[PDB]
Every structure is written in structure tokens, then in C-alpha cells.
């Protein structure tokens, strides 16, 4: 329904690396549209090792992102497709990943619950447009200058109406998606539960001390992570519902937003 707006290549100045991976490379940049103020942006491009199926995946990523217009989803500013290299220009998120922040900064209980509700709000919007993310984790949520949390990285997102390989993030994946390859709105919900666990701990990996095969066997047999010492009991209740074995009993993101919003203005 929506479409990426094309931007003149000469408006963009690429400045410095924000993050590199197998996916490609994200740069910090600036966009100087004539008669408008200069703004910081992020520019995502392809590995120097090109392949035309990778150009198409990047353009598909942009089209998915162009459908989103929400305060808790990283915004699409436009694309540069005439010429080479190709750039997808996105909103710049000054404060980096949610993961790095909670690991390295002091955060209050009211911040922890608001960030949780903000991510649920962004995922609710994604689902309400007919998509599933399939890759949610705290390293994939970014923080703006106002410390507003926003869902990023749509590399693996797919229309709901319809995996990677040895890179499967086992610690964030629901049992049914590991065993039967069934990805759905309710496996996104399971992953959000694990994200909440990350928000309330300061370790790098959930299930610390277990490898990936140990995690899978333990979780399919009914193990669940216990309540972090610094997590309020009403919050852990919500976290726990995201991990019910039967996916149909897990709440929707619309329900999660509401439950979290009630605690967000709770004094206790």
C-alpha cells in the first residue's frame, strides 16, 4: 500500500560505521535536503561482495518498512536506487541498542517497564499490518535521543498470510518454531518474553551457563527462566505468560500493551 520515497544521491553524506554483519553494513550519515535543515540518519547498504538477490532482499526490507509509521518502529526516510551503491536511509537512533544500554547504564524500575510497553506497542503495530518479525531480541531494539525504544532490523520479517540456518537464535525461539518451523505472531510473543528477561538482568545471554542444545532440550521439556531478583512480581507474571507451552494461550501484543500500560502508572 505504501512505497519508499526516492532521494537524490547528492543529498547524502556517509560518515562512519554503526554496525557490520553478514547482512551488510549500516553507516551513520547526514541528509541535506535543499531548504531543509541537515539531519543525522543511518544508511544501510550491501556487502562489497554483491549479488542481485541481495539487492532485491534489501529493497523488500525497505518496502516492508515503508508500511510502518509508528513511534516505536525505526522510521524509513527513503531509498537511493539510481546508481550504485544502493542505500536504505532510516531514522538515526542516537543511544544505540537497548541491550548495550541496560548492560552498561543505571536504569530505574519505571524506565524498565516503559521500554517494555514501548516495544509491545511497536510489535502490536507490526502485527496489525500483517507481518511477523521472526528475530526479536534486545540487541535488535534501538533507543532514540529521548530514550524511546523502537523495533529495528526487518531483515527476516515476512507477511503473516504465508529459516536462516546455523544462526538460529535458539535462546529467543519458541519450541514449536525450533521443532516444527512454525513461526507466527505467538512466536514473536515468546521472543518478547525473553527480551523482557534481558531488560531485568545484566548478563549477556539468557540461560547463562547452558549451550544451545541444552537450552532446547530443557525448554521443550518444560523448564522456564525464574524471576530475576530485581524484577517486580507483577512484571514477571506478564513475562511468564509469553512462554506458555500452547501458543494459542499466549497473549496478543494488544493485550500485553494494556497490561504493561496499567503498571506503567502504578506506584508500587
Residue numbers in the entry: 1532 to 1693, 1699 to 1804
Can you provide the manuscript's text about this entry?
The kinase described in this study is from the M. brevicollis receptor tyrosine kinase C (RTKC) family.
We determined the crystal structure at 1.95 Å resolution of the kinase domain of the M. brevicollis receptor tyrosine kinase C8 (RTKC8, a member of the choanoflagellate receptor tyrosine kinase C family) bound to the kinase inhibitor staurospaurine. The RTKC8 kinase domain is in an active conformation, with two staurosporine molecules bound to the kinase, one at the active site and another at the peptide-substrate binding site. The kinase is crystallized in “DFGin” conformation where the DFG-Asp is pointed towards the active site and the DFG-Phe interacts with the αC-helix. Another molecule of staurosporine was found bound to the C-lobe of the kinase domain in a hydrophobic groove between the activation loop, the αEF helix and the αG helix. The ligand interacts with hydrophobic residues (Gly 1701, Gly 1702, Val 1704, Val 1706) in the activation loop and Trp 1752, Asn 1748 and Gln 1749 in the αG-helix. The purified RTKC8 kinase is catalytically active and can phosphorylate tyrosine residue containing peptides generated from its C-terminal tail sequence.
